[PDB]
Structure 1
Amino acid sequence: GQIKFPDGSSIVAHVERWAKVRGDKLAYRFLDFSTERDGVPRDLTWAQFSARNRAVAARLQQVTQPGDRVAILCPQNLDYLVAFFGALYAGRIAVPLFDPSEPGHVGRLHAVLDNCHPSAILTTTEAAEGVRKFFRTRPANQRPRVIAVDAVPDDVASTWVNPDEPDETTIAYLQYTSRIPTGVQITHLNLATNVVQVIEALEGEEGDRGLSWLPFFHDMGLITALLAPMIGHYFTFMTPAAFVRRPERWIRELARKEGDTGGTISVAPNFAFDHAAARGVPKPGSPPLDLSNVKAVLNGSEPISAATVRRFNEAFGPFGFPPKAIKPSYGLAEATLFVSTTPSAEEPKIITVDRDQLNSGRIVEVDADSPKAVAQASAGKVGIAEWAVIVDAESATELPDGQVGEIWISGQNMGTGYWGKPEESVATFQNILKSRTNPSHAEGATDDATWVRTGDYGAFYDGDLYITGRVKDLVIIDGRNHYPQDLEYSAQEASKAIRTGYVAAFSVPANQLPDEVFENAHSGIKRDPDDTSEQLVIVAERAPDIGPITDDIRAAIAVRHGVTVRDVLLTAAGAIPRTSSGKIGRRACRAAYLDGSL
């Protein structure tokens, strides 16, 4: 009926079965935008695919003990996938990570390795010395063996032994998300379950194509690549760097290829759509572009702007892109990826709700032209055999539809906890819902089941799930609540000097505010060391005279919201702290303001 796999079932064997049936057929396709001019399809067949997995696994089994953790440090390549699957084949724990020769940020990776203590490192000959230099910075006591995956001979596959059948508790891999790092424990069960949850939600036919430029070290990027080998189908990808430079590459891959059966499926964050809108439109001397075939492009991992949807359809619509193609979706790493998505036959639902009531917790529609209106885009309906409920965090009781609360999630796809963090694991992953309500969005789930606290505010409305954002990023000032995305939207629209989606809004205790703020007359707050009250701060990058810019922002937010901005900090482009996925670190940006920067 609902996601019950037979006993003894395992992925290594499942992919191997497909590998025997699809033998000479294409498994993965990598588009190389490197020194070559434009595109180099690098292909890996099922036969090659299976062969390398077993070969790498054979070397892993000799050099690593079962239960040990295996880190994958590779740029985006076929070998990244050969390395991951190899870890599963060997029976070890994969730990997806990135190339330490990436533009800075490899100091953060020290911290991750500190959490899981990997016994071995998988990399490529290209990135190997970089990994060597990287680890030279760490003590010798922790220096795990490094294996170049492309360098391992195919003949080593001969000594491979299939690992023992997994149980309900067996950890498949550690998915790290974003002060100390948190690896989520994802079992083999979590992996197979969510893959099944996604495929049923996608309604994929046997003619569809699929593609992603997203990084594999990101949960949204990883499972998307892991989808294809379990369905039988092929999967084509490129590097994220390739997309940022020429977003037209992605659309061209989305566009109808000559003579295919089905539509294209992909996923990408909200900011990518805006990116693809400006720079991703083809030049006039390029061949014709037909986007009519696109089935579903999922938009997730960050709050989706109705503007981005309107802008994108406006841009690629004339090329035949359907409006029902954009599929807003919600999910997290604690679900390993997927929680809810917009149904496959449907248009994306974007609503507009009263601002003041939203800040009070109620979801109530209002006309879009109304002065207090905030656009809200649905994440659609919850995935199969998993449940999402709106709860009162303090009372652990299910709230009625239309009222905002913390989102709790439960399902077989949910992780078993955080690696090496026992206390936090219990508080987050083990919670029981003490009370249900009228149509109980938890219906179908056992009264005794554990719920995972997502840490996000949300609500249910007219059959769709809406995510209002994170509890941690909520801006409370002087007794009234503010959603930070709302403030920065009003801020960026105030001055054209502000790079778009470069803004971060937060609150700081008045006593902590810098001395400069109190010396500034235009602030409106004076310095009392005994004042612990939260004050609004807004930080924004300067797209390619502070005085007028700050005042416009101060005025616009003051008028639309009713809060006074105490400090507006303009930095150079790219200065604002971000994360792995490319999203703004809010609270991390706050810290960067308080510890001071440039």
Structure 2
Amino acid sequence: LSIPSMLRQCVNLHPDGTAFTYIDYERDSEGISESLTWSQVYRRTLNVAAEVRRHAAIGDRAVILAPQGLDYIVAFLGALQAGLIAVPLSAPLDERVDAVVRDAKPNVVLTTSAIMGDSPPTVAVDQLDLDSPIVDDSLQTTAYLQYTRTPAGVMITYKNILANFQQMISAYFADTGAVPPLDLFIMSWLPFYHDMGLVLGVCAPIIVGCGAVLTSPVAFLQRPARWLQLMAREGQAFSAAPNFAFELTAAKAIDDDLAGLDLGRIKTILCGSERVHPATLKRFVDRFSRFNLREFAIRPAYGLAEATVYVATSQAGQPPEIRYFEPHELSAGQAKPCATGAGTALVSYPLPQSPIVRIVDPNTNTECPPGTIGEIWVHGDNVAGGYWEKPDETERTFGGALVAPSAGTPVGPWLRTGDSGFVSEDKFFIIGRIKDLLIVYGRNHSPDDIEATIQEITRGRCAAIAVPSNGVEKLVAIVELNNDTERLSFVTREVTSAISTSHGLSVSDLVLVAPGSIPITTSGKVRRAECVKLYRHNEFTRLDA
């Protein structure tokens, strides 16, 4: 039923089995290990549940404001144990944190003494005696709020979680009868305050019944090779990452750091949370196949917080499948398949069985014929019931109703994803986020394709954004370069020409910025939203000024 009850079952079956292992690279460049069996994490959880019960009631929200580590896991679990709606947030570094706190009106804050320095009662869980030897007041419905201009908290129920896990276990392990191997372990460096990192690092170990090897996204960014190192531990690894993490690892990992790594036991590496670029997948597999990385272990995956996490993934037992389409028709709105190597390449996602996806005209609420691009709509029991205390926004995002649905298609409710895609053959494809699209003379260009063009030339971070000006959208590219005045001219004319010939677009402004200037998250590739208003308020410093 609930995560607390599943954790108590983990303790019953395998009290002394290892549940969570956290590798901390902050003091020791090589990582200090600290591990909890099922019984020990349960004890900590119960102690946190006792402490939160002094401050909040069943149903109250509990904000978690801790760094990545075991204390975060035990704050979150202890909150669910005492029947509180957890709110996983990031450690203060912030304005969106106070906006979330105002929205969720929490009755307790769970944090650590270290960031205690950075009103509801505040608990430093590390300063609690967490290993001192009941509180099962768990809810059977709402587990936690997942926060993503006003901050909207996705209500995630235990039903959402279990349904998404059943869909996930079945698609990821369809080749083994929806049974994961005995050898499975979870490895993740993804932040626990993002949906991918929370469901994979914290929730999955309990629901699947395996242990997790965990670390911090700052450890991964410092030395991406550690990711491969930790996945190559004993057993069959299951991990996940955004596309730029695949690129970064292919780029910055030294073959000396990988002395004697066996990557052949890695069960699954999901690639998600952003557009999956075939070129990235090929660079990753071509560079790490030497260590026995299996190509069928790379699994592109699509989802969003509003669907708990998972919507679709590639066929189990096969390497990712790539399809090719004519780009002029793609911008026109039509998917026309073309020969291998011609046109744009898109990762083929098999139409999922559960949840179900449809391609729908956002202006008429009617399905699109195959090959016609529209908005991806999602139906299924993993789709959240709404945004916390936001009835109107809930209605606009979750209340998709299909007019004259096709045979076998529910009328509603549909989750409108904001993503543009199409169906070809019996696979569907994701173009990208609609708000990020560049519309020029009635045509639609995707910023992921523009940035993939620019990157190959720059080898750095990009953002292709749309700046409105006197009734149209103008193309602007924020381009990170390594840090003379001719060399700058070489890159500007190269990139400008590459966008001209590959897209038929004129670049209205190329902003050469230093590395780190484009807003990125720890798990977000680029916030093209933020780029637009940083550029409009002239907050960028160029290298050629």
TM-score normalised by structure 1 residue count = 0.85
CA distance in 2, matches of 1:534, 1:38: 48
Aligned position for 1:183: 153
Give, as a single letter, the amino acid of the residue that structure 1 aligns with 2:244: F
Q: What letter is aligned with 2:110? A: L
8 Å CA contact retained: 2:15, 2:38: yes
Question: For 1:509, which of 463, 468, 477 is the aligned residue?
Answer: 468
Aligned to 1:266: 239
Q: CA deviation at 1:420?
A: 2.9
Question: C-alpha separation between the residues in 2 aligned to 1:247 and 1:155?
Answer: 33
Distance, in Å, in 2 between the alignment partners of 1:71 and 1:164 is 16
Q: Identify which of 129, 133, 152 aligns with 1:153.
A: 129
Mean alpha-carbon deviation: is it higher for 577-586 or for 16-25?
577-586
Structure 1 residue aligned with 2:396: 427
2:421 equivalent to 1:458:
yes
Q: What residue is the counterpart of 1:240 in the other structure? A: 217
Cα 1:425–1:146 shift into 2, 3 Å: same
Partners of 1:396 and 1:144 lie apart in 2 by 44
Question: Which string of whole-angstrom CA distances, capped at 9 and with x for unpartnered residues, describes residues 368-393 of structure 1?
Answer: 444xx1111123442x5311111111
Letter in 2 for 1:353: F
Q: 1:289-330, CA deviations, whole angstroms, 9 ceiling, x for partnerless residues?
A: 221122211100110111111111110011111121211110
Q: Distance in 2 between matches of 1:99 and 1:164?
A: 26
Counterpart of 2:212, as a letter, is F
Alignment-derived partner of residue 534 in structure 1: 473
DSSP-derived class of the 1:36 partner: coil
The answer on 1:251 being equivalent to 2:228 is yes
Q: Helix, strand or coil: the match of 1:75?
A: coil
Which consecutive unaligned segments of at least 5 residues does structure 1 have? 1-8, 132-142, 511-530
Q: How does 1:431-442 map to 2 (within 5 A)?
A: 431-437=400-406
Residue 464 (structure 1) shift: 2.1
Sort the Cα spacing of 1:385 and 1:369 in 2 relative to 1 into closer, same or farther, 3 A: closer
Would the aligned equivalents of 1:195 and 1:223 in 2 still touch at CA under 8 Å?
no
2:37 is matched with which residue?
Answer: 45
Letter in 2 for 1:587: A
Match of 1:391 in 2: 360
Can you list the C-alpha shifts for 1:65-124, whole angstroms capped at 9, x where unaligned? 222110111111111110111111010110001111xxx4x2332222222122211112
Q: In the alignment, does 2:370 pair up with 1:401?
A: yes
Contact persistence 2:82–2:138 (CA under 8 A): no
Give per-residue Cα distances to partners, 1:422-442, cap 9 Å, x unaligned: 2111111112222333xx5xx
Distance 2:230 2:190 in 1: 14
Match of 2:444 in 1: 481
8 Å contact from structure 1 (residues 212, 237) kept in 2: yes
- Does residue 557 (structure 1) correspond to residue 499 (structure 2)? The answer is yes
Identity %: 38
- Matched position secondary structure for 1:338: coil
Distance 2:122 2:366 in 1: 50
Moved more, 289-298 or 349-358: 289-298
- Read off the aligned partner of 2:391 and give its amino acid letter: P
How far the C-alpha of 1:249 sits from its partner, in A, is 1.2
Distance 1:533 1:233 in 2: 53
| Residues 52 and 256 of structure 1, relative CA distance in 2, 3 Å threshold | closer
Report the counterpart of residue 412 of structure 2 in structure 1: 449
Q: 1:586 aligns with which of 516, 524, 528?
A: 528
Q: CA deviation at 1:256?
A: 5.5
Q: Distance in 2 between matches of 1:306 and 1:116?
A: 39
Alignment correspondent of 1:95:
87
Counterpart Cα distance in 2 of 1:405 and 1:275: 32
**Quick one: distance in 2 between partners of 1:417 and 1:206?**
36
1:154-195 deviations in Å (ceiling 9; x for gaps):
5877xx4321652xxx32111011x22221111222122212
Provide the rounded CA distance (Å) in 1 between the counterparts of 2:472 and 2:208: 55
1:272-421 equivalences under 5 Å are 272-283=245-256, 287-370=259-342, 373-382=343-352, 384-421=353-390
CA contact (8 A) 1:536 1:567 kept: yes
Q: Which moved more, 1:427-436 or 1:294-303?
A: 427-436
Distance 1:589 1:218, change over 3 A: same
Q: Is the 8 A contact 2:111 2:124 kept in 1?
A: yes
The 3-state SS of whatever aligns with 1:423 is: helix
Q: Distance in 2 between matches of 1:164 and 1:82?
A: 15
Q: Which residue of 2 aligns with 1:526?
A: none
Rounded Cα–Cα distance in structure 1 between residues aligned with 2:453 and 2:314: 27
SS in 1 for 2:162: helix
Which secondary structure state, in structure 2, belongs to the residue aligned with residue 359 of structure 1?
helix
**Cα offset, 1:458, TM superposition:** 0.8
Q: Which amino acid aligns with 2:245?
A: A
Gapped regions of structure 2 (runs ≥ 5): 174-179
Given that residues 418 and 425 in structure 1 are in contact (C-alpha distance below 8 angstroms), is that contact kept between their aligned partners in structure 2?
yes
Q: Which structure 2 residues correspond to residues 180-259 of structure 1 after superposition, within 5 A?
A: 180-203=150-173, 204-225=180-201, 226-255=203-232, 257=234
C-alpha displacement of 1:580? 5.1
The alignment status of 1:120 with 2:120, answered yes or no, reads: no
> How far is 1:152 from its partner?
2.4
Cα distance in structure 2, aligned partners of 1:86 and 1:558: 55
Is contact 1:59–1:156 with CA below 8 Å preserved after alignment? no
Report deviation, 1:404.
1.4
TM-score normalised by structure 2 residue count: 0.93
Q: Does the 8 Å contact 2:335/2:373 carry over to 1?
A: yes
Contact 2:241/2:271, CA 8 A, preserved across alignment? yes
Q: Which residue identity does 1:426 align to in structure 2?
A: E
- C-alpha distance 165-318 of structure 1, shift in aligned 2 (>3 A): closer
* Aligned equivalent of 2:98: 110
| C-alpha RMSD of matched pairs (Å) | 2.0
Contact preservation (8 Å) 2:476, 2:509: yes
Aligned residues: 530
